Design a protein around this ligand. Structure first.
Ligand SMILES: CC(=O)N[C@@H]1[C@@H](O)[C@H](O[C@@H]2O[C@H](CO)[C@@H](O[C@@H]3O[C@H](CO[C@H]4O[C@H](CO)[C@@H](O)[C@H](O)[C@@H]4O[C@@H]4O[C@H](CO)[C@@H](O)[C@H](O)[C@H]4NC(C)=O)[C@@H](O)[C@H](O[C@H]4O[C@H](CO)[C@@H](O)[C@H](O)[C@@H]4O[C@@H]4O[C@H](CO)[C@@H](O)[C@H](O)[C@H]4NC(C)=O)[C@@H]3O)[C@H](O)[C@H]2NC(C)=O)[C@@H](CO)O[C@H]1NC(=O)C[C@H](N)C(=O)O
Ligand SMILES: [Ca+2]
Ligand SMILES: [Ca+2]
Ligand SMILES: [Mn+2]
Ligand SMILES: [Mn+2]
Lengths: 241, 240
C-alpha cells in the first residue's frame, strides 16, 4: 500500500551483488566493509578514498501526487589507528546515481568533493552526515576546532555540527532520518555505554538533489590515517503525502 | 538485524529505474504495467512476450554456509480481451540474474521456456507461479483441461495445479511464499467477491536455482491474446 525500498546488511559478504564499490573500498575476511586502503597486515595507510553505494536507486519524490520520500537508515562503524591525530572520517551520503569519487577528494574532503568546488554549494549535489576525526585549522580550514558530527549540504563546510569524541575501536551506532513534512534531517549516534550525540538541520532535500538518488558511505585519509570499518547498515525509504 | 531486501510498488510510474523491462513490457498512462503488446488503441495483439525483473539481485542461498532465504511476494493483476478464448497467461517467476526471454517462448510457454527444452528440467532454472487461461489440449499438451493456477519447476508442465476461473477485467490478489524450513511454495489468490484459490508444492529451491537470482513477472500471447496488466507488487526476502 506504499511505494518503498528497504534493505539491510548485518555483515558484508565477499561478492555482494547489490553494492557498488568505489576506490579502495573492500571487504575483510570477517565480513567487515573497509572503506579505506590497508597494507598486507591490515594497517591503515595514507592518501586513500573508498565508497559504496547501493545499486537500487531511491526515488526522492513523485510530483503528480505531490509525494516526497521519507528516509531512515541505521548503521554501525568503528575506527582504528596508531596515531594521536587519526584521519579523516566516514560519512553517510546521498548523491546522484552516477556519483563517482571526485579528483583530489582524499584527506579532509572525505571522498565527497573536488578541492576546486568543495565550498561552492552551486557546484555540488550531496547531502552527507559526517563523522569527522581530524580538524587541524591550518588544513581543514572549514572545520570547527574539535572532532564533530556534521550535516553537509553541497559543501564540506557543515551547515550544523555537534562536538563528538572518537573512541579507538569502539562501535558507534547511528540513526539518520529525513522527515519530508518538517524537511528535517535528524541524526542520533550512540556508543555502547549509552553516550549519545544528536544533531538536526532543516533542509528541503528536493531543492538540492535530483528525483532519483543513490545512498551509501564514503571515507578518506590524507597524510594522517585510520581504518574506517562498516559493520552493518539498514535503510528504508517510503513515498509519502 | 538481518540480511534482507524489500520493495513495494502500489502502482507503476512511467519512470521506474529499478525495473528491467524485457520484450513488449511497458507502462500505461494510468500507471499499470502492461506485460504484453497492444495496438495503437490499447487492444491486445497476437504473438507477444513481455517480462519485468527487479534490478536488485536476491541472495536465495549461500553455498559456503548453507543459509537459505525465505521469500514473500504479493501482487495484483487483471486481464482483458475481446476474445471468447483469451490467452495465454501471466506468471510470477524466479530465475538466474541474466535471464532473458527465450526464443519461441510466446503463446503457451508464457515467455519462460524455449519449445525444445520446455519439458526438460535439466535445461532450465526457473520457479514460476502461473495463472494460465488457455488450455487447449491439442496445443497446450502439457496442461490440465481447464484454466488453472500452477507451480512450475523447470518446466511448463506444472508440478501442481488447481482449477481457476479467469474473470474479465477483474483484479486477482495473490500471495506467494517460500518457507525454507519446510521447502514449500504456497500460493493464495482471491477475487474481489472473496472467491479463493490455494496451491502448494514442496520443492527445495537450492536444488533448482543458483545462489543469486532475480524475481519478476512474465506474460505471453500466441494466436489468441489478452492484455496482462500488473497493478501492484511487493516483495521481501530475508537470508536466515
Ligand atoms: C496435416 C495435419 O493434420 N497435421 C497435424 C497438425 O496440424 C498438428 O498440429 C497441431 O494442430 C492443432 C490443431 O490445429 C494446433 O492447435 C491449435 O493451435 C493454435 C495455435 O496455438 C498457438 O496459440 C495458442 C493461443 O495463444 C497458444 O496457447 C499456443 O501455445 C500456440 O502459440 C505458439 O506457442 C509456441 C510455443 O509452444 C510459440 O513458439 C509460438 O510462437 C506461439 N505462436 C504464436 C503465433 O505466437 C490455437 O490457436 C488453437 O486454439 C483454437 O482452436 C482450438 C480448437 O482446435 C480451441 O479449443 C481454442 O479455444 C482456439 O479456438 C479459437 O479461439 C479464438 C478466440 O476465441 C476464436 O476466434 C477461434 O475461432 C477459435 N478457433 C477454433 C478452431 O475453435 C489450437 O489449440 C496445434 O498448435 C498444432 N501443433 C503444432 C506443434 O503445430 C500436429 C500435432 O497435433 O499433428 C498433425 N497430424 C499428424 O501429423 C497426423 C499424420 N501423421 C499426418 O497427417 O501427417
Ligand atoms: Ca575534517
Ligand atoms: Ca496454457
Ligand atoms: Mn567537518
Ligand atoms: Mn499451465
Amino acid at each position: 500500500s506504499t511505494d518503498s525500498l528497504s534493505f539491510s546488511f548485518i555483515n558484508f559478504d565477499r561478492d555482494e551483488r547489490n553494492l557498488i564499490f568505489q576506490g579502495d573500498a573492500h571487504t575483510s575476511r570477517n565480513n567487515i566493509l573497509q572503506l579505506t586502503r590497508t597494507d598486507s597486515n591490515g594497517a591503515p595507510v595514507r592518501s586513500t578514498v573508498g565508497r559504496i553505494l547501493h545499486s537500487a536507486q531511491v526515488r526522492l519524490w513523485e510530483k503528480s501526487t505531490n509525494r516526497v520520500a521519507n528516509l531512515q537508515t541505521q548503521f554501525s562503524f568503528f575506527l582504528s589507528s596508531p596515531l594521536s591525530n587519526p584521519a579523516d572520517g566516514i560519512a553517510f551520503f546521498i548523491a546522484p546515481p552516477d556519483t563517482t569519487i571526485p579528483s583530489g577528494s582524499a584527506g579532509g574532503l572525505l571522498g565527497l568533493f573536488n578541492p576546486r568546488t568543495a565550498l561552492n554549494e552551486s557546484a555540488n549535489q550531496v547531502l552527507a552526515v559526517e563523522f569527522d576525526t581530524f580538524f587541524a585549522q591550518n588544513s581543514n580550514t572549514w572545520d570547527p576546532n574539535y572532532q564533530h558530527i556534521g550535516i553537509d549540504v553541497n559543501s564540506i563546510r557543515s551547515s550544523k555540527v555537534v562536538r563528538w569524541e572518537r573512541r579507538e575501536g569502539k562501535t558507534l551506532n547511528v540513526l539518520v532520518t529525513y522527515n519530508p513534512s518538517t524537511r528535517t534531517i535528524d541524526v542520533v549516534a550512540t556508543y555502547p555505554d549509552g553516550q549519545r550525540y544528536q544533531l538536526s538541520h532543516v533542509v528541503d532535500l528536493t531543492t538540492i538533489l535530483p528525483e532519483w538518488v543513490r545512498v551509501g558511505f564514503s571515507a578518506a585519509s590524507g597524510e594522517q590515517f585510520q581504518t574506517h570499518n562498516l559493520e552493518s547498515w539498514s535503510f528504508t525509504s517510503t513515498l509519502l503525502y
